[PDB]
């Protein structure tokens, strides 16, 4: 019925929102993994800057 | 009665007559108003069980024949903007073209408020149109 | 000689000689197909000999029916029968069936199908008959000389915008 | 008639929804006990006895067959309706058409995720079977990546 379809489309919109957020999660996780190497390469440039 | 007039103009004369109706839903509503009194149990949403046949007879009478032609345009009311209602659901199958209107589109200032995605037409084939 | 039990263990009638005789006596191979249907109804499953007799009836028959039928092909009918026999009955075709198919291809003049059947016979059976191979080669050479090696519109040259896609 | 005579038939129905409506109308006019959506309790039995008549007869019975392709319409993708649920449960698989894909241009608009064939790959030809064995996985991977 009308209310049933209202709730159904609300659920579908929430599912779409979840999928989009999952995609951006994957993107940001890829970027984080790419940039994580800075840890092993940092903390040895600003020695005399101190 | 109006359909009988059009049928006469179609057969006894041989014209291409236009037939505008506003609104068909009132026919089904009126029949439902009296179904129970006649002694017929309500079927669904409160509509009378004989809705399908009652509407189909009239829709079939509304058609183009060999003698003449009838171009019919019928307004259809969708209660609470709920297209799943049995009367519109039955009406969908007795038409060549359907134009669906959206309250959201109307609110957005677009007039006519037409949803092409839900709209349809039979002659949308390359053989008929360019 | 030995009983054969059906899917559910019920026996079947292995006496198919009367049906083979009926097939040989038929005129149009559609009648032979009807006979096979009757055998299936009567629980007398066709055997390799029955299928070969059906193929012979197809080869020797005038046409599919008394009245012409558009796009009829004895080769297609026999290939369908072979598929039904091998896949839906678990029966390996014998050399007789392939020889009948090659004879039909030669009679029709389909040299390409003759080549394919020759390759199939060489692969599975013990080679293809020399007479049939020579007849197929002669038909191919005749077509080449007459100019019917390939269709015409295919040879016709068409550009990107010239192809008249209907 | 053909099935019992060792031949193969294809019965198409368009559509069971209106048949159900007609049966409901008849029952309500005849004062029979209704049920969900006012469809009496015999609707499921009606559809079951209509569809079970489609079968693949055994070799000893003639070898004939009947294939059933009933058609059903869902309102705004309301697949939970009584008739749709009954028919889906009865049938040996479904082919789902999607309005989104139909408008997008995929014609036919089959939605593979919502479409299934309980029979499986046993009904495919050998070459088609082998091709599909890889095609199905390829499509699954493409969907997962998309």
Query: Closest Cα of chain D to A35: distance in Å?
Result: 23
- Spatial neighbors of D102 by CB under 8 A, at least 6 apart, are D109
C-alpha D32/C-alpha B34 separation (Å) is 20
In terms of C-beta distances under 8 Å and separation of at least 24 residues, what long-range contacts does B110-117 make, across chains too? B117/D99, B117/D103
Reduced 3-state DSSP string for chain B: CHHHHHHHHHHHHCCEEEEEECCCHHHHHHHHHHHHHHCCCCCECCECCCHHHHHHHHHHHCCCCCCCEEEEEECCCCHHHCCCCHHHHHHHCCCCEECCECHHHHHCCCCCCECCCCCEECCCCCCCCC
Reduced to 3 states, what is the DSSP secondary structure of residue D39?
A: coil
Q: Do C37 and D62 touch (CB under 8 A)?
A: yes
In the DSSP assignment, the letter for residue D83 is H
C-alpha A24/C-alpha A30 separation (Å) is 10
Residue C98: both structure tokens together: 């392939």
Please check whether residue B129 is in contact with residue B123, taking contact to mean a CB–CB distance below 8 angstroms: yes
Residue D44: both structure tokens together: 């499921």
Selected residue of D37, D74, D77 to mutate for chain A interface (largest A Cβ count, 10 A): D77
Q: Do D38 and B49 touch (CB under 8 A)?
A: yes
Query: Could you give the count of Cα atoms lying within 13 Å of D75 in the half-sphere of its Cβ?
Result: 19
Neighboring chain D residues of C43 at a CB cutoff of 8 Å? 59-60
Q: Which of these, B80, B82, B86, lies nearest to B45 by C-alpha position?
A: B86
CB atoms within 10 A of CB B102: 15
Which chains are adjacent to chain C, needing at least 3 Cβ pairs under 8 Å? D
Selected residue of D15, D17, D28 to mutate for chain B interface (largest B Cβ count, 10 A): D28
Q: Taking an 8 Å Cβ-Cβ cutoff, which residues of chain C contact chain D?
A: 6-8, 10, 12, 37-38, 40-41, 43, 45, 87
- DSSP annotation string for D6-17: T-EEEEEES-HH
In the DSSP assignment, the letter for residue D53 is T
Query: Resolution limit in angstroms?
Result: 3.7
Beta bridge partners of B97: B121
Q: Which helix (H) or strand (E) holds D68?
A: strand D65-70
Please check whether residue D3 is in contact with residue D57, taking contact to mean a CB–CB distance below 8 angstroms: yes
C-alpha C133/C-alpha C118 separation (Å) is 7
Q: Taking an 8 Å Cβ-Cβ cutoff, which residues of chain D contact chain A?
A: 76-78
- DSSP annotation string for chain C: ----B-TTS-B-----HHHHHHHHH-SSHHHHHHHHHHHHHHT----HHHHHHHHHHHHHSS-SSSS--TT--HHHHHHHHHHHHHHHH-----HHHHHHHHHHHHHHT-HHHHHHHHHHHHHSSS---HHHHHHHHHHHHHHHHHT-SS-HHHHS---TTT----
Distances (CA, A) of B32 to A3, A41, C139: 23, 80, 78
Please check whether residue D72 is in contact with residue D83, taking contact to mean a CB–CB distance below 8 angstroms: yes
C-alpha C19/C-alpha B57 separation (Å) is 56
Q: Is D32 a catalytic residue?
A: no
In the DSSP assignment, the letter for residue D91 is S
Query: Which chain B residue shows the shortest CA-CA distance from D38?
Result: B43
Please check whether residue D62 is in contact with residue D4, taking contact to mean a CB–CB distance below 8 angstroms: yes
Neighboring chain B residues of D76 at a CB cutoff of 8 Å? 83-84
Chains A and C touch (3+ CB pairs under 8 A): no
Q: Which of these, B20, B86, B98, lies nearest to B54 by C-alpha position?
A: B86
Query: Which chain C residue shows the shortest CA-CA distance from D123?
Result: C88
Please check whether residue C114 is in contact with residue C132, taking contact to mean a CB–CB distance below 8 angstroms: yes
Residue C163: both structure tokens together: 């192809």
- Spatial neighbors of C24 by CB under 8 A, at least 6 apart, are C53, C56, C57
Q: Is B80 on the interface with A (CB under 8 A)?
A: yes
In A4-33, the residues whose Cβ lies within 8 Å of chain B are: 5
Residue D143: both structure tokens together: 């969907």
- Spatial neighbors of B100 by CB under 8 A, at least 6 apart, are B83, B114, B115, B118, B119
CB atoms within 10 A of CB B32: 21
C-alpha D47/C-alpha D54 separation (Å) is 12
Selected residue of C10, C30, C34, C40 to mutate for chain D interface (largest D Cβ count, 10 A): C40
Q: Which of these, B2, B12, B130, lies nearest to B72 by C-alpha position?
A: B2
Axis crossing angle, helix B51-61 with helix B25-38, rounded to the nearest 10? 140
- Residue C28 region, left (φ>0) first, then alpha (ψ -120 to 50), else beta? beta
Q: Do D61 and C41 touch (CB under 8 A)?
A: yes
Please check whether residue C113 is in contact with residue C105, taking contact to mean a CB–CB distance below 8 angstroms: yes
Please check whether residue C117 is in contact with residue C105, taking contact to mean a CB–CB distance below 8 angstroms: yes
Cβ contacts below 8 Å, chain C against chain D, sum to: 28
The residue annotated as part of the active site, out of D53, D107, D118, D143, is: D118
- Residue B46 region, left (φ>0) first, then alpha (ψ -120 to 50), else beta? left
Cβ contacts below 8 Å, chain A against chain D, sum to: 4
- Spatial neighbors of B51 by CB under 8 A, at least 6 apart, are B28, B31, B32, B43, B86, B87, B90
Neighboring chain B residues of D103 at a CB cutoff of 8 Å? 117
Q: Which of these, C4, C26, C25, C6, lies nearest to C15 by C-alpha position?
A: C4
Which chains are adjacent to chain A, needing at least 3 Cβ pairs under 8 Å? B, D
Q: Do B49 and D25 touch (CB under 8 A)?
A: yes
Q: Do B52 and D37 touch (CB under 8 A)?
A: no
């Amino acid at each position: 019925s009308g209310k049933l379809r209202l709730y159904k489309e609300k659920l579908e919109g929430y599912n779409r929102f979840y999928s989009i957020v999952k995609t951006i999660k994957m993107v940001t996780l890829a970027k984080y993994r790419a940039a994580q190497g800075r840890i092993r390469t940092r903390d040895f440039s600003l020695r005399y800057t101190e | 009665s109006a359909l009988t007039m059009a049928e006469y103009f179609r057969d006894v004369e041989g014209q291409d007559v236009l037939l505008f109706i506003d609104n068909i839903f009132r026919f089904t509503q009126a029949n439902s108003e009296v179904s129970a009194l006649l002694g017929r149990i309500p079927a669904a949403v409160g509509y009378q069980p004989t809705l399908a046949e009652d509407l189909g007879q009239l829709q079939e009478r509304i058609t183009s024949t060999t003698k003449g032609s009838i171009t019919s345009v019928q307004a259809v009311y969708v209660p609470a903007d709920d297209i799943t209602d049995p009367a519109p659901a039955t009406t969908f199958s007795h038409l060549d073209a359907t134009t669906v209107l959206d309250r959201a589109v109307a609110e957005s200032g677009i007039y006519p408020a037409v949803n092409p995605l839900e709209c349809a037409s039979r002659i949308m084939d390359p053989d008929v149109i360019s | 000689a030995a009983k054969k039990y059906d899917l559910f263990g019920y026996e079947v009638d292995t006496n198919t000689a009367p049906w083979i005789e009926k097939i040989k006596k038929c005129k149009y191979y559609d009648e032979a197909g009807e006979v096979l249907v009757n055998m299936n109804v009567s629980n007398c499953p066709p055997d390799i000999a029955t299928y070969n007799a059906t193929l012979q009836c197809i080869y020797q028959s005038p046409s599919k029916q008394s009245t012409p039928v558009d796009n009829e092909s004895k080769f297609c009918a026999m290939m369908d029968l072979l598929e039904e026999m091998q896949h839906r009955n678990r029966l390996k075709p014998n050399e007789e069936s392939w020889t009948w198919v090659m004879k039909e291809c030669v009679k029709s003049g389909q040299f390409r199908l003759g080549y394919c059947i020759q390759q199939v016979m060489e692969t599975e059976c013990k080679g293809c008959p020399a007479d049939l191979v020579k007849a197929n080669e002669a038909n191919a050479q005749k077509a080449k000389t007459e100019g019917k090696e390939h269709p015409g519109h295919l040879s016709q040259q068409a550009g990107l915008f010239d192809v008249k896609v209907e | 008639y053909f099935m019992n005579r060792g031949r193969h038939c294809l019965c198409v129905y368009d559509d069971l929804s209106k048949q159900a409506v007609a049966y409901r109308q008849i029952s309500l006019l005849l004062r029979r006990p209704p049920g969900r959506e006012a469809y009496p309790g015999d609707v499921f039995y009606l559809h079951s006895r209509l569809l079970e008549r489609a079968a693949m007869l055994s070799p000893g019975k003639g070898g004939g067959s009947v294939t059933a392709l009933p058609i059903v319409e869902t309102l705004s993708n309301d697949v939970t309706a009584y008739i749709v649920t009954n028919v889906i449960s009865i049938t040996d698989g479904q082919i789902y058409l999607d309005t989104k894909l139909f408008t997008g241009g995929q014609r036919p608009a089959v939605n593979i995720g919502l479409s299934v064939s309980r029979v499986g790959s046993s009904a495919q030809n050998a070459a088609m079977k082998g091709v599909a064995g890889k095609l199905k996985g390829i499509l699954a991977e493409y969907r997962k990546l998309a």
